[PDB]
């Protein structure tokens, strides 16, 4: 065994394109529409609960997730990828910030941490 894939699966093509990122964006394009609007005294995020079956209880599937008491997230694309990102985002808000400064991270810095995790899946082996 051992993970013997220690090389990048995303690489530059002759035209300078990173194929796997483009294809990931294509998967996002197929995803259900979600949106966000910023007001003076608040922000709203919204999406459609596209239920896969009417027997499914769509209230048990949360597309909009609390990351911190003052930060929320919504997505378009692959649901399972989102779910694990939410788990990592919630944890990193504690490990790399709240356990150090005794307060929750500002929006831009939590976004930065999530972005870093997504960048690494674009270069790591």
């Amino acid at each position: 065994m051992t993970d013997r894939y220690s090389f990048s699966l995303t690489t530059f093509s002759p035209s300078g394109k990173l194929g796997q990122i483009d294809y990931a964006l294509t998967a996002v394009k197929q995803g259900v529409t979600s949106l966000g609007i910023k007001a003076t005294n608040g922000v709203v995020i919204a999406t459609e609960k596209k239920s896969s079956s009417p027997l499914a209880m769509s209230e048990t599937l949360s597309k909009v997730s609390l990351l911190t008491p003052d930060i929320g997230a919504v997505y378009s694309g692959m649901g399972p990828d989102y779910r694990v990102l939410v788990d990592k985002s919630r944890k990193v808000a504690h490990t790399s910030y709240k356990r150090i400064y005794g307060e929750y991270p500002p929006t831009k810095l939590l976004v930065s941490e999530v972005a870093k995790i997504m960048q690494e899946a674009t270069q790591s082996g």
């Binding site: 356990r99 150090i100 400064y101 005794g102 307060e103 500002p106 810095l109 930065s112």
Partner: protein, 204 residues
């Protein structure tokens, strides 16, 4: 032998009306031998002030460490760190060395730039926060400082009255401690001006 009383020294901090004060002696020694009369124990990162008593090598190391961390904080946050936030950072940083600690007695002083509220805090060598409303003391003459502050202090002192109170608290405490003295500095801190005063005191 006791690491917290090899070099000697003291820090005291007080709150007043729309102001804070932090003060320290200037002595560094090797037990009985006086080595330096210019060893300042108060540092600042933006508008947040940090006094550190105890083992001098750790005092220097921690100053460099908190300069390091507050500089990265500022680059990422795009703003200066506040006293309340910095207090947590000091606590976190000390407790990470729980079983091999820095032998220090840190003291935070400053005014929150948004609320304007005066803030002071103290720590033991392992990160426990003492957030007193009135005053914080630290060092080899902390008993003496507790005695001075408890009788001399009264709330809501004006900046120039607070200066006299904290100065007399430091001076008379230091004169009853063999390992403290050799000069003293007092910072008077207001929301957007800080004044630094070196005091004249006995040099034995």
């Amino acid at each position: 032998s006791d690491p917290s009383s090899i070099n000697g020294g003291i820090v005291v901090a007080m709150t007043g009306k729309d102001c804070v004060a932090i003060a320290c002696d200037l002595r560094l020694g090797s037990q009985s031998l006086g080595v330096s009369n210019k060893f300042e124990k108060i540092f600042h990162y933006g508008h947040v002030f940090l006094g550190i008593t105890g083992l001098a090598t750790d005092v220097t190391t921690l100053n460099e460490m908190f300069r390091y961390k507050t500089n990265l904080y500022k680059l990422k946050e795009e703003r200066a760190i506040e006293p309340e936030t910095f207090t947590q950072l000091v606590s976190s940083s000390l407790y990470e060395r729980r079983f091999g600690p820095y032998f220090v007695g840190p003291v935070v002083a400053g005014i929150n730039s948004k609320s304007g509220k005066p803030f002071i805090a103290g720590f033991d060598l392992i990160g426990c926060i003492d957030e007193a409303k009135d005053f914080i003391v630290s060092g080899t003459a902390s008993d003496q400082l507790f005695g001075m502050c408890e009788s001399l202090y009264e709330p809501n002192l004006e900046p120039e009255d607070l200066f006299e109170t904290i100065s007399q608290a430091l001076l008379n405490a230091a004169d009853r401690d063999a390992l403290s003295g050799w000069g003293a500095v007092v910072y008077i801190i207001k929301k957007d001006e800080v004044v630094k005063r070196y005091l004249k005191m006995r040099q034995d």
